[PDB]
Amino acid sequence: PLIVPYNLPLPGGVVPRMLITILGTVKPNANRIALDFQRGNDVAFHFNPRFNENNRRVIVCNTKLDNNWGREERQSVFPFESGKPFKIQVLVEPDHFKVAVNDAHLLQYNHRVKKLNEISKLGISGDIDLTSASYTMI
Ligand SMILES: OC[C@H]1O[C@H](OC[C@H]2O[C@H](O[C@]3(CO[C@H]4O[C@H](CO)[C@H](O)[C@H](O)[C@H]4O)O[C@H](CO)[C@@H](O)[C@@H]3O)[C@H](O)[C@@H](O)[C@@H]2O)[C@H](O)[C@@H](O)[C@H]1O
């Protein structure tokens, strides 16, 4: 197991055709998960499953620039379940991050941060047991 919150360095940032794979298990009674693809203090891509926001489950995606969160992009398709193992695949494509969970496409998030090669860390946090976090070029 990896200790959460976990920092995965992304050496030289991200680039199209880079695939980031996160394996873990959601804790029982989880409230949140977060992936934070960071460009320094900025969060180029925040991917945030919320298990109980006003008694609904939703994935909130956003970008944080100069400590300001921007416009949220929300996805009510919610493939995570408390207690269950998951796989998150984040594929960097030219215009967006493409996220699949458990081998099913979930969402895309258009690049707001343009300096992809400066998005050099992925923070993984929240109510999970983290099994692995890695990347490969496909
Ligand atoms: O429920 C409606 C909401 O309306 C006002 O807030 C508007 C404000 O909401 C969001 O701003 C933040 C974002 O931080 C949270 O979400 C990001 C991802 O987007 C991260 O997950 C953070 O960890 C979360 O804490 O949410 C609070 C407000 O709820 C702000 O302090 C944060 O900036 C949204 O991202 C942003 O665009 C939008 O302007 C109202 O203030 C709220 O009380 C609430 O009624």
From Swiss-Prot:
Keyword Nucleus carried by entry: yes
UniProt-listed GO biological process terms: eosinophil chemotaxis; epithelial cell differentiation; innate immune response; macrophage chemotaxis; monocyte chemotaxis; mononuclear cell migration; mRNA processing; negative regulation of endocytosis
Regions crossing the membrane: none
Domain Galectin: 6-136
Renumbered ranges of motif Nuclear export signal: 114-129
Coiled coil start-end: none
Recorded GO MF terms: carbohydrate binding; chemoattractant activity; disaccharide binding; IgE binding; laminin binding; molecular condensate scaffold activity; protein phosphatase binding; protein phosphatase inhibitor activity
Phosphoserine: residues bearing it: 76
Protein's cellular compartments: Cytoplasm; Nucleus; Secreted
Subunit text: Probably forms homo- or heterodimers. Interacts with DMBT1. Interacts with CD6 and ALCAM. Forms a complex with the ITGA3, ITGB1 and CSPG4. Interacts with LGALS3BP, LYPD3, ZFTRAF1 and UACA. Interacts with TRIM16; this interaction mediates autophagy of damage endomembranes. Interacts with cargo receptor TMED10; the interaction mediates the translocation from the cytoplasm into the ERGIC (endoplasmic reticulum-Golgi intermediate compartment) and thereby secretion.
Protein's job: Galactose-specific lectin which binds IgE. May mediate with the alpha-3, beta-1 integrin the stimulation by CSPG4 of endothelial cells migration. Together with DMBT1, required for terminal differentiation of columnar epithelial cells during early embryogenesis. In the nucleus: acts as a pre-mRNA splicing factor. Involved in acute inflammatory responses including neutrophil activation and adhesion, chemoattraction of monocytes macrophages, opsonization of apoptotic neutrophils, and activation of mast cells.
Name recorded for this polypeptide: Galectin-3
Classification of source organism: Eukaryota, Metazoa, Chordata, Craniata, Vertebrata
Residues of the full protein shown: 113 to 250 of 250
